[PDB]
Structure formats: C-alpha cells, structure tokens
Amino acid sequence: DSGSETAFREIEIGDGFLPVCSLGPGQVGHLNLGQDVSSLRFFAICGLQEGFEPFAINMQRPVTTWFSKSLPQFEPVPPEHPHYEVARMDGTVDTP
Amino acid sequence: EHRAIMVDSMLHTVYRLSRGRSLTKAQRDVIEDCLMALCRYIRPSMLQHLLRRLVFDVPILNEFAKMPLKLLTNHYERCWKYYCLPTGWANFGVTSEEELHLTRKLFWGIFDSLAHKKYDQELYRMAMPCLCAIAGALPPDYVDASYSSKNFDPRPVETLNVIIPEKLDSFINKFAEYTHEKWAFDKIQNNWSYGENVDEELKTHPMLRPYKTFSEKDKEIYRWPIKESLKAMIAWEWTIEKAREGEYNPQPPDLSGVTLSRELQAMAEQLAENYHNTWGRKKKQELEAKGGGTHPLLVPYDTLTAKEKARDREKAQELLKFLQMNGYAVTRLDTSSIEKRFAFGFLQQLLRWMDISQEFIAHLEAVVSSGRVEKSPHEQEIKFFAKILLPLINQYFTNHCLYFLSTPAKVLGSGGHASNKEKEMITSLFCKLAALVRHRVSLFGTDAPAVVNCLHILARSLDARTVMKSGPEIVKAGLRSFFESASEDIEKMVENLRQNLTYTTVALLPVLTTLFQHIAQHQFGDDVILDDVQVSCYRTLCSIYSLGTTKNTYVEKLRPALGECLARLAAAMPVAFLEPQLNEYNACSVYTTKSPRERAILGLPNSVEEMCPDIPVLDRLMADIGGLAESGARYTEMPHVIEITLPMLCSYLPRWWERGPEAPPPALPAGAPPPCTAVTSDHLNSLLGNILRIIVNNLGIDEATWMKRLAVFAQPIVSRARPELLHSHFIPTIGRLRKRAGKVVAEEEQLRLEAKAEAEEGELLVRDEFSVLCRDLYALYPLLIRYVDNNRAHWLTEPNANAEELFRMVGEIFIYWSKSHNFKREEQNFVVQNEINNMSFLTADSKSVQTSLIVATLKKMLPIGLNMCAPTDQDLIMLAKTRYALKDTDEEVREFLQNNLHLQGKVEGSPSLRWQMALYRGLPGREEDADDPEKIVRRVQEVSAVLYHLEQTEHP
C-alpha cells in the first residue's frame, strides 16, 4: 500500500523458513516448487534475473510435505499451556 | 488491568487535584502534565470513569476546561482505532457501549456549548482539535441506545405538585402493591417464601404479608416511592392510562431486558433519568451537608456509566414491562435507526447550521453591498462557522470518506455502509455549500483556501448513483442545477474573455475537476452525467475549446486548469463527443434517452456534431496532432493542443478504448449496437507516438515546461503500446538524449578539470543545462517506465536486440548521471522545485527521495540486461567490477577482460552454473553467435560497469 516492493522487511533468520500454503474450503492450489525450472513458469520473468535460486533446484527426490490432518488426537497436556494445568498430589494418608 | 480499580481511583483523585484550588500555576501545570502522561500510557478500558467525569465537566467550556479538553483530544486521537474501527483493535480492542454513548453525548455537548458561547481566539483554536478528534473517534454508523433523551443539581419533576388523577390512582396503588409483590416473588424464586411473621429466611424483608393482611399503615410508607414514581410519570408530558378496562405472588416474571416500541422504551429511559433526578437531589442535599462533592450516580444520567444507568433503567423498564403485561399504555418520536446513527444526527446538525449559514451569508452580503458595516447580528455565527465548522467537516469527511462513499451494494468502506437517506442528504448538503459559495467569493476571503479545500473533500466521496437511481428528486435537481449554473457561468466567462469574474478566478475551477475525477474513478458517468448534465458539459467543453482558440495572456495562463478540467470531464462524460456519428447507437446519448419533442424544447439540434461544432471528430484531431508532430513546431507556437486537447485525448481514449470494437466486448448482445467510439490500440499507439515526437522536437526548447504535466496526463496512454514503438520512436529519443547528455558531461568534466572563475561560471551554465536535462528526462522517461514494465516479459523471453540496444543507451545515460555529481544535485533541485517526487510516486503506484533514472535503469531494465549477459559471463562480472573498484577506465578493463577471457566459468564447476547454462541455452532466441569473444567482453564490461555504479549508489 505504501508502494514498497518488498512485502515484509527486517526478518530475522531464526530457526529457518519453509514453503507453506493454507487452502480454504473447496480450494485447489498447485504448489510448484522449483524441482525443474522448465515447470517453473514466470521464473525468468521474476527470479532468475534477481538472483533467487529455485527451491529444491538439485533435490533429486520430490520434496516431502506435511498437511494438517484435522483429526482429533489425544496428546499430552503441555506444561506451558496458557489455560490448563495438571498437578500431581500423592502420598497423603487419606488422599490417594 | 490487574490493578485497574485503584488505578482508576488514582485517576479520579488526580483529576480532583488538578481541579484543586489554592494552587500556583506551576503546580497546576505539573498536575496537568501528570494527567497527560498517565492517561497517555494507561489503557482506555479503565479510563471510562475518568472519561465520564470529563464528559460531565468539560461541556461547561470554562477557562478551567483547558486540560480536560486537551486530554479529550489526545486520548481520542490515540484511540481512534479503539473507538471508530468496528473490528477489535490489535492493541486494546473494541470500545464499550458506555464509552460510545459517552463520546456521543460529549460531542453533542461540546458542539452546542461552543455554539452558544461567544467566539474567543484561544477557546476556539484549542477546542476545534477536540471536536474534530471526537468526531473522528466516534463511529458514525453507531446507533445510540436512546436517541430521544433528556456538584450536579438534578431537578426532579413535580411529582407531588402534579396531583395524580383518580382515573388511574387505583392503578398507581395497584402497581405499588405489585412492586411489593415483586419483592415477595423474587424472594420466592430465591426460595424465601414470604412469611406473615418475621421469617429467618426472609433476610431482606423479614415480615412480609399479602396485601389483604398487611397493615396499610406500613403499606403506605413502603409504597410511597412507587407512588411518587408514577406521579412523576404522569407529571411529565407522558400520559399513562389503562389500555384495558379495569381498576401477592406475581408468577409472570417481569423482564426489563426485553425490547418494546422505541418511543415507549426511550420514555422509560427518561423515567429512569427522573429517578436519577430525585435520587441525586436527595443525595446532593446529603452530600452538601458533608462538604460538597460529586457522586458517580449524581452525575447526569445520560453521561453516567452504563452500569448504574443499567440498574436505574432496569427499574424503569421493570415498571414499563409491568404496564404492557397488565394492560396500560403511555403516550407522550419514532426515531429510525438511520436517525439513531450519529452520522445522520451530525448531518441534521450540518443542514440546520447550513440554513443558518446561508442566512448569515445573506445578511453579511447585504451589509458588504451597503458599504462596510462591521456590526453584524450573526458575527458569532460567522466566527463559529469559520473557526470550527469548516475544519470539523473537513477532517470528518477526510477520515470517514471510505464509509460515506460506501453503498449497500458497493461496500468498500472498512466498517459499515452509508445509508441512502444520509447519502442524499449530504449530496444536497454539498449542493447547499455550492450555493453558499455561488458568486460569493468576496465574502470569506480569508477563509477561502479552507472553503475550497472542504469543497474538494465534499465533492469526493459522493455516491451520486444512489441519488440519480432511486433517489430524491429534490437533491437530484439541486445537483443538476449546480451543474447547469456552473456551465452557464463558464459560458459567461467565455463570452467575456472572447463579480462572476472574481468568482471563477478565486475558484480556478478545481472543485469541478475533482468532481469529474471522482466520477471517472468510480464510473459514475453512466447515470450521473446524463441529459441536461451531458448537454451542459458538452457546451462547456466547446466553450473552453473556444478559450483555447483565443490567445490572450489570461487564457494562456488559464490553459492548465482548462485542460485539466477538460480531461476530467472527458473521462467522466457519458457519450462519445469525439466521432459522434454513432451516438444514435450509443444508448447513453441525450437524443436516444430523450423524445424528439423534448430535444426540440431543450434546443438540442439532434446532432452532437452540430451543437459542438468547434471540436471536430477524433480522426480530425489526430490528423491535426500528427501534422503538428511532423512539422515539429515549437511548444509556444501552438500551445492550445498540448495544453487542453492532448490531455482530453489522453483521458478520453484510454477510457473509451474498452468500449471500442477493437477491445473485446463484454458480450455479443452488449456489443450488438456499434460502439460510438471506434478507437484501436493502433490509434492509441499513434497518439503516443505523436506525443513522443512533439517531446523530442521540443526537447531543446527551454520554454517547454509543461511537458511534465503532459507526461502525467499521458501515463494512461502509454499502456497498450505496440512493441514496434520501441525501435520506431523510443530508440531515437533515448539516443538523442544520451548523445546530448554525453556532450553535457564532457563539458562538465572540462569545466571541473579547469579551475578558474570563468570555469565556475561555465559550471553554473552546465548546471542550467543539467536542470533542463532533468526536465527532459522527466518528460521522456516516465513513459518509458510504464512501457518497459508493461512489455517486460515479452522482451525478456524473446531477445529483442533493439531492446538490448536501448538498454545500452540508458546504461550510458546512467553512467553519465553517476559520474556527474552536478547532475545529481540538479536532479534533486529540479525535483524539489517542480514537485517531481509527486509524479514519481504516482508513476510508482501506477506502473529527492528516489531518482527516476535509478528506477528506470538500475531497477526496471537491469534484469533484462543481466539475462542478455550469460551466467558464465556473470562468473567474470565480479572481476570486472573489482577492476572498476581499482578505477580502471572502460577500455582498460576491456584489455584485462580480453586477457582474462580464459577463466570463464564451467558447468562441471558447480551445479548452479549447470542449470543456469541449461536455461540460458534453452531460451529459444539464443544463438551461437553470442559465443564470439568480442560480444562477450562488450556485454561483460557493460553489465559490470552498470552493477559497479549501482553498488556505489547503494553504498555511498
């Protein structure tokens, strides 16, 4: 909106970055990672010139992805849960 | 938030301390600054009680309200997202309804008190920021709970003076007994079944008998407050009487939370305010015996926090719901939710002071026509309007233009959409301001810039589609008469040019220009500009073309505004006035929408060519501009074309190009009538070529100053240009500019190497040459910006050798600019002088802070240069760049490049070079002729020099 080309600025590297996409209901998206630049369209238009390596350029095997399963699973309660706490009391003569 | 309660109590006590007496001015300033910083860093959620205290005290508008209203404006400006934005603000969230009614009643009270008070410089100067801040903070689509509503001395109504009539006194007694029964019933629901004797479970009311057995001696003292409440209810203008004919456990529960008729609920809320009046009267009699002071409930009920108000309203609505379940009606109005919106109430205020303002401009016009009469009965109104109302509506419309322009269908506002009623009301308000300033520029001479600024703001954000289609005939006729009066005014000016003269001069016609710009922006021209509006605008464009034909000094200096408004009306006009032979197939034509009888009575001769004969068809103006470009006349030789007609073309042709048969029609039935405009992409390309030809022909003429505005006008016509236009015109123009700039940099280098007073004089001469050079670049290059950005991909994929040649030319231009420090400072000076940064920003959004040449060469076309050069050449680019860092000249670095040609990169060296080579040879336009070493060294040297100057610019 201000006219700057870069979307986000001053981004710390931190742990790292990964390709990601969240599709809504009834949505179809083609996640074209750079397995082959021939499949990568518009790359020479924007990205081959500017100095951006395609993601997984030399990666022989296809890139492995992870999807939100959306299946309720019973997992241990995190100790740092902002709302829920589990406390262990034992050894009382009457209370087990 | 953990300690919000005593934080708020500390806020209240600091308010009391700043309102303390026997304090030195420095001490009061210290406490006020403490309040400033404290409320600035305290979250608005706990500031509600302090804001209530402000809403009580500051409408008095005493000299002692300075810090309260300053706190008002600071807090509201800070929390304008906390209030106005319907979505929860990411910092502190949404605003409570209590705070909403607080700021609404605050705005109302401040405005009415400032209205009734005499003008004072300090008071008005510091109060208008507060009022505009409150207006911006308050959500205009917010609806108050009770639009119809009524230290503090609350006056109760004459409860005992108004004797209760016997037509309902039985019902008064019945409801008193019924409130006692409701006490008993609440106990029963709490499981304390009411016992006749003293009952342990009856904690609130130990002895509690049915009214048959309860003694009337104590029944009277229990029921006296309800008696007084109902006597008050009939003491007001309300009339309570049995709806049905007639007149200790009321199992039907009374639910004060339910909603009834609006007038009935509002009068119940006013009864709650009367309960407040009685309670606050007795409590202030008690409190003044304790030493005075104000109590939170004792503050006015409307300004009171919505929780004590909630309790008092709960009591009053319990009474009211008793009435409507036991058959009693109250009759005192019918305020719609539109009127409950604060925007519509603000508009009612605006129109009431608008009729007051037309009255006072009438009497001040009467007193200035009769010599000079300083004494004015409405001078208070004059000062109040000028110092408060004009900036208030200015800032209000500026920060709520998105909502007001929002339609029920076209909801582009962040929050809600403007109602149709308020939409037409504010359109007619804008018409009323037009009549206010109609031939009335001598008055409000000092306020005229603010008047015209607010006129532009009000002209923007007018959804006149609602007014024209399903809208009031009154406001539609008001705007039509405004357009007609403006057009006949233009006729009077054109006849005179061959007081309304001072009116048009003080205007400079910019409000109409902004109006057609907004109409073109939202495509209002389909319906808003029609019939009489179309005819008036057509005779107006004919008359301003007559002004363009005339060549006096006044019209020569007026041609900027005339051309700008002509282009705006061309982009906001409904029918093809150019080549209008097909207007009868155009459905928007005045003749097609009008009967022949109506054309006869309106004077329309059934021919656009006939009632606008001064301006011929676009084919004829194209032949004219092509002949002018071929002849290469000076800018001052015939300035009317480029001043007026060329902006008109660069606005009309891009707008009507989509309608043209060359462009894809939306549908076959839609395109079944032949389009009135038959322009083509070839037509727009030829017009762009004509503009570029006249620019290159007037490049050396120092009187060619308006080429900057020509470029701004021709930004839209750059799009959809033919690729062949590059080699046809852009290469000669850029090449001539490059050659001239090379001559200038050679002269500048000579003048900088010689040290002498005449050398400094020659350096000043080349400074002037650099300034006119910057003018030439700002006339030439903005077209090239959109050209290269629109056809970047085509020249990127297909290797246009002409595009690479023009890359080399613009690279040489960049080299001259980088090695000329004089050119850089003249660039910045020309930018600040001619406001070039605004045009650069506009081109950036619609493809000194930043350099247009830097954007043109170092950013836009450096990528196509970098793909013209090979990646194996990019393996020598850093070596050539480091040689340029060692400051070796171009021929010299070519020598070491030829000597070092054998260290070119290899595919097997790294996998990156492998796929880079693969893509580079897989480009279909690649040929083996690039393997020639001479071409390689040329391109390596060029790209490395460009990158070296770019990195020097990036890191000074």
Side-chain angles (χ1 to χ4, degrees), chain A, chain B residues 1-199 201-211 213-310 312-349 351-511 513-565 567-647 649-808 810-857 859-956:
Chain A
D1 199 297
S2 65
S4 63
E5 277 77 6
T6 60
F8 310 95
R9 317 158 207 66
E10 177 38 45
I11 318 178
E12 55 163 359
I13 296 171
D15 312 301
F17 282 145
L18 280 178
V20 82
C21 76
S22 176
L23 296 149
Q27 296 313 304
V28 184
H30 182 268
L31 199 61
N32 190 4
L33 265 53
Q35 174 94 350
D36 59 300
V37 179
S38 175
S39 176
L40 262 199
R41 55 181 42 65
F42 292 93
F43 183 36
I45 311 299
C46 285
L48 191 273
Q49 312 170 300
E50 200 171 359
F52 287 90
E53 186 78 58
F55 195 94
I57 166 65
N58 307 301
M59 282 205 208
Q60 176 180 0
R61 313 176 310 245
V63 194
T64 313
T65 44
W66 283 76
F67 80 95
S68 299
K69 193 179 181 182
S70 304
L71 186 274
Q73 297 272 240
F74 270 97
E75 310 185 3
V77 178
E80 66 278 355
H81 197 276
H83 311 89
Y84 292 145
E85 187 266 356
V86 171
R88 292 181 178 238
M89 311 76 78
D90 49 1
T92 314
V93 51
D94 51 297
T95 301
Chain B
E1 299 192 299
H2 34 87
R3 300 306 173 181
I5 158 182
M6 70 302 297
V7 151
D8 199 0
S9 75
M10 148 206 87
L11 288 164
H12 188 269
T13 54
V14 170
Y15 211 56
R16 293 180 52 64
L17 293 195
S18 189
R19 272 300 318 119
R21 64 178 54 65
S22 306
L23 294 180
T24 308
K25 175 181 300 300
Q27 307 181 0
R28 322 160 81 73
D29 293 358
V30 169
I31 313 181
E32 295 162 1
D33 296 358
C34 168
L35 217 30
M36 301 335 307
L38 196 57
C39 165
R40 150 176 39 273
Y41 296 98
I42 287 189
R43 183 163 191 177
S45 58
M46 41 298 297
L47 286 165
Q48 49 172 119
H49 291 269
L50 181 37
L51 181 60
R52 170 194 54 184
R53 291 288 306 96
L54 299 160
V55 165
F56 184 15
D57 315 323
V58 76
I60 306 302
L61 292 190
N62 204 293
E63 201 283 302
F64 272 37
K66 265 47 174 300
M67 154 295 274
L69 75 92
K70 178 56 182 172
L71 189 62
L72 291 203
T73 173
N74 296 359
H75 170 265
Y76 278 31
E77 165 263 358
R78 161 205 171 184
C79 315
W80 90 269
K81 302 303 291 302
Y82 183 89
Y83 271 31
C84 181
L85 175 68
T87 308
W89 187 18
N91 301 60
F92 324 76
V94 281
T95 169
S96 171
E97 299 181 60
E98 167 253 1
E99 294 160 356
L100 283 172
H101 93 255
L102 277 183
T103 172
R104 188 181 186 119
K105 301 171 191 304
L106 181 58
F107 183 86
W108 293 137
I110 299 294
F111 184 86
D112 71 62
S113 303
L114 198 60
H116 292 326
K117 284 191 175 64
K118 187 59 63 178
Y119 157 80
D120 174 292
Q121 176 51 60
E122 167 76 3
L123 291 184
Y124 280 35
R125 180 205 58 65
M126 95 162 304
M128 159 301 299
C130 174
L131 198 60
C132 73
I134 301 171
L138 183 48
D141 46 2
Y142 150 77
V143 287
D144 47 5
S146 55
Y147 187 88
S148 305
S149 299
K150 181 63 176 182
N151 298 357
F152 183 42
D153 49 298
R155 284 79 46 179
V157 75
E158 296 182 359
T159 69
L160 315 189
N161 311 61
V162 175
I163 169 183
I164 183 69
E166 276 54 60
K167 59 174 190 64
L168 75 159
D169 201 2
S170 177
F171 142 82
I172 308 303
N173 194 4
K174 181 263 170 299
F175 187 34
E177 310 158 2
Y178 185 93
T179 56
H180 304 327
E181 300 169 1
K182 266 305 179 190
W183 189 331
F185 163 83
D186 295 359
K187 297 316 118 184
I188 295 186
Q189 306 315 115
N190 207 1
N191 208 5
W192 320 145
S193 59
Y194 70 97
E196 286 66 61
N197 50 63
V198 279
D199 201 357
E201 66 176 2
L202 265 296
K203 315 164 185 178
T204 61
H205 217 271
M207 94 185 147
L208 197 39
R209 305 180 276 179
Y211 176 83
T213 67
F214 226 147
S215 64
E216 274 53 61
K217 45 179 180 181
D218 68 59
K219 292 306 297 183
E220 282 285 359
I221 187 184
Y222 297 155
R223 80 201 186 182
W224 190 220
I226 308 95
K227 285 282 200 306
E228 294 165 299
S229 149
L230 290 154
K231 292 165 179 50
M233 203 192 187
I234 206 175
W236 293 96
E237 62 183 61
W238 316 323
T239 311
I240 171 64
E241 182 66 4
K242 344 276 183 61
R244 91 293 177 242
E245 178 74 3
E247 307 179 2
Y248 208 79
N249 195 7
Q251 282 304 120
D254 202 299
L255 305 176
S256 63
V258 310
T259 167
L260 265 45
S261 170
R262 181 219 72 69
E263 176 56 60
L264 191 67
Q265 206 166 0
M267 76 57 54
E269 181 145 0
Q270 218 274 1
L271 193 46
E273 170 266 356
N274 172 244
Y275 301 152
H276 163 223
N277 289 358
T278 315
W279 186 95
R281 185 48 61 121
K282 49 170 166 290
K283 263 56 187 181
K284 85 165 302 302
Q285 295 160 0
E286 304 155 2
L287 203 38
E288 76 200 1
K290 307 311 171 182
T294 193
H295 183 269
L297 216 165
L298 178 148
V299 319
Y301 167 89
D302 55 298
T303 68
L304 168 58
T305 48
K307 52 102 174 179
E308 294 275 62
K309 169 188 315 182
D312 205 308
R313 184 160 34 182
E314 171 264 357
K315 173 190 184 304
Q317 298 289 352
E318 174 265 356
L319 165 141
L320 180 64
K321 305 320 159 181
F322 157 85
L323 310 176
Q324 279 70 58
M325 328 185 278
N326 297 60
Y328 311 103
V330 200
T331 300
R332 46 149 59 181
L333 181 58
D334 300 357
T335 295
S336 73
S337 63
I338 297 91
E339 297 175 0
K340 294 180 180 179
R341 293 196 174 182
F342 146 79
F344 204 50
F346 194 14
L347 288 195
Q348 292 159 0
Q349 179 195 307
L351 264 81
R352 165 202 61 66
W353 215 297
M354 172 46 237
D355 65 65
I356 296 176
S357 76
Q358 73 193 1
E359 185 264 358
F360 91 74
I361 70 161
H363 91 299
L364 63 63
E365 200 174 2
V367 304
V368 284
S369 63
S370 57
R372 41 178 182 179
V373 185
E374 188 277 302
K375 172 57 189 58
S376 299
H378 313 89
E379 57 94 1
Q380 174 176 356
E381 305 177 0
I382 309 177
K383 305 310 161 301
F384 181 90
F385 142 68
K387 305 309 176 182
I388 312 298
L389 215 31
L390 194 59
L392 174 58
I393 190 56
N394 199 0
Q395 174 159 352
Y396 187 86
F397 218 83
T398 303
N399 60 10
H400 300 147
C401 60
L402 212 56
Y403 153 43
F404 265 8
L405 191 50
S406 180
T407 0
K410 309 181 179 185
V411 199
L412 72 171
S414 60
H417 75 90
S419 304
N420 296 359
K421 302 172 53 60
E422 76 173 299
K423 198 157 306 172
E424 55 92 3
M425 194 181 179
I426 201 165
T427 301
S428 65
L429 184 61
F430 168 81
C431 304
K432 291 176 189 65
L433 324 190
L436 191 84
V437 302
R438 182 59 186 180
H439 293 337
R440 277 155 167 176
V441 297
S442 58
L443 58 95
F444 304 151
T446 64
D447 317 300
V451 167
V452 299
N453 192 3
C454 307
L455 205 48
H456 294 96
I457 304 299
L458 269 293
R460 304 166 168 294
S461 181
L462 281 189
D463 195 293
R465 273 172 176 296
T466 301
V467 182
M468 311 335 297
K469 176 182 180 180
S470 182
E473 188 269 356
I474 310 300
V475 48
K476 96 182 281 293
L479 51 92
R480 284 161 58 240
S481 66
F482 172 40
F483 306 150
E484 202 292 301
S485 66
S487 300
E488 62 91 4
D489 177 61
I490 302 307
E491 308 312 298
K492 300 180 302 190
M493 337 316 304
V494 294
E495 301 298 300
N496 195 183
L497 285 162
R498 53 183 161 62
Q499 179 182 181
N500 88 311
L501 278 301
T502 67
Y503 159 82
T504 303
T505 297
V506 160
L508 210 59
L509 308 180
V511 183
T513 299
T514 297
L515 181 59
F516 332 123
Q517 169 67 3
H518 154 269
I519 289 167
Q521 166 198 1
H522 280 27
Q523 279 287 356
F524 280 100
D526 307 357
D527 67 303
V528 175
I529 316 292
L530 265 186
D531 193 359
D532 45 62
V533 191
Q534 159 194 357
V535 171
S536 62
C537 297
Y538 282 22
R539 55 95 177 243
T540 296
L541 55 87
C542 176
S543 77
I544 71 180
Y545 188 88
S546 310
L547 300 186
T549 309
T550 68
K551 312 194 70 61
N552 44 293
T553 302
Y554 315 93
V555 301
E556 286 281 358
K557 82 193 169 54
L558 196 56
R559 276 174 186 181
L562 295 175
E564 189 180 1
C565 74
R568 292 311 184 296
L569 60 84
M573 143 197 58
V575 197
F577 82 121
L578 288 174
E579 54 178 353
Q581 320 93 359
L582 317 179
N583 58 355
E584 71 280 354
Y585 332 126
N586 192 1
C588 302
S589 174
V590 48
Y591 320 108
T592 64
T593 63
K594 254 176 22 163
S595 303
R597 164 206 52 65
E598 193 173 358
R599 310 160 209 175
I601 70 179
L602 262 304
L604 270 301
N606 207 3
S607 168
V608 167
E609 302 86 359
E610 183 158 58
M611 43 44 75
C612 177
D614 201 3
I615 315 191
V617 306
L618 49 82
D619 192 1
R620 167 44 41 210
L621 297 63
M622 180 85 98
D624 295 356
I625 184 59
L628 181 61
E630 183 73 4
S631 72
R634 312 279 62 65
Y635 195 11
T636 319
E637 192 266 356
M638 155 38 50
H640 168 34
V641 176
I642 319 89
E643 273 278 0
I644 308 175
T645 84
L646 285 194
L649 293 171
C650 302
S651 61
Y652 169 95
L653 167 42
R655 183 204 191 241
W656 286 91
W657 175 88
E658 290 87 5
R659 289 79 173 242
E662 176 267 353
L668 285 78
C676 46
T677 298
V679 298
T680 64
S681 59
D682 199 2
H683 207 87
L684 70 91
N685 185 64
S686 173
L687 194 157
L688 186 56
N690 291 178
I691 298 175
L692 189 60
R693 181 64 183 295
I694 69 176
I695 289 181
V696 71
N697 289 354
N698 302 353
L699 214 63
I701 306 310
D702 291 358
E703 210 75 4
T705 311
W706 209 220
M707 326 322 259
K708 58 188 181 307
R709 188 55 171 118
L710 175 66
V712 187
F713 265 119
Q715 307 282 177
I717 208 61
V718 171
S719 175
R720 306 156 190 118
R722 260 144 188 63
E724 296 84 4
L725 203 62
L726 197 162
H727 191 90
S728 84
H729 284 88
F730 284 90
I731 287 191
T733 58
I734 267 61
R736 166 203 283 236
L737 198 56
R738 172 196 51 65
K739 274 297 300 175
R740 174 181 180 240
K743 301 307 298 177
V744 187
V745 59
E747 298 149 1
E748 177 207 4
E749 170 261 0
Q750 174 50 240
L751 268 305
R752 79 161 64 122
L753 70 89
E754 54 190 358
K756 157 175 43 61
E758 195 270 354
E760 308 288 355
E761 167 263 358
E763 187 74 4
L764 297 173
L765 260 300
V766 315
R767 292 187 181 182
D768 302 355
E769 204 168 0
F770 273 144
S771 74
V772 55
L773 189 55
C774 303
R775 187 200 65 179
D776 295 0
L777 277 78
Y778 296 141
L780 188 65
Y781 262 28
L783 296 53
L784 190 56
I785 296 313
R786 312 194 50 176
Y787 192 40
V788 63
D789 203 0
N790 290 0
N791 317 326
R792 193 84 67 66
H794 155 44
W795 325 336
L796 206 156
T797 311
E798 293 75 60
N800 188 2
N802 306 355
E804 335 292 0
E805 168 197 1
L806 167 149
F807 163 81
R808 310 155 203 238
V810 299
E812 299 198 4
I813 280 155
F814 203 97
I815 290 186
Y816 312 144
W817 181 106
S818 177
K819 305 172 180 178
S820 304
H821 148 82
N822 188 4
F823 195 24
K824 298 179 66 177
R825 49 169 294 296
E826 275 290 355
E827 193 283 356
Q828 292 128 7
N829 296 356
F830 195 87
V831 160
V832 52
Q833 287 158 0
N834 301 62
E835 296 287 357
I836 296 299
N837 49 2
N838 301 357
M839 164 292 297
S840 300
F841 275 25
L842 176 65
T843 312
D845 310 296
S846 62
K847 309 179 182 309
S848 180
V849 176
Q850 67 81 349
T851 296
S852 177
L853 183 43
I854 280 183
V855 174
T857 303
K859 309 304 167 184
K860 260 52 189 303
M861 150 152 38
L862 182 61
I864 164 179
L866 199 50
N867 278 21
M868 149 274 286
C869 80
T872 175
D873 299 359
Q874 295 164 357
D875 301 353
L876 290 319
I877 287 184
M878 62 304 297
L879 156 54
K881 286 190 58 174
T882 55
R883 292 183 285 237
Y884 273 99
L886 330 169
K887 306 310 173 185
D888 300 355
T889 183
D890 50 358
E891 307 286 355
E892 190 175 357
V893 284
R894 294 164 193 181
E895 319 295 354
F896 330 101
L897 187 51
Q898 297 153 2
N899 301 358
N900 299 358
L901 262 171
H902 60 274
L903 315 80
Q904 46 190 0
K906 300 173 181 56
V907 155
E908 62 273 359
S910 66
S912 177
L913 268 303
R914 167 198 57 64
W915 71 270
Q916 285 164 359
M917 271 315 98
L919 268 305
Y920 187 84
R921 64 196 54 241
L923 184 74
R926 201 63 62 185
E927 295 166 0
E928 64 176 0
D929 58 358
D931 304 357
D932 291 0
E934 61 274 39
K935 301 185 178 183
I936 300 185
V937 290
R938 298 309 91 172
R939 58 188 167 179
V940 171
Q941 169 262 354
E942 292 153 0
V943 177
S944 150
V946 174
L947 289 184
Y948 156 81
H949 291 93
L950 182 50
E951 60 89 5
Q952 295 290 354
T953 307
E954 292 166 359
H955 327 93

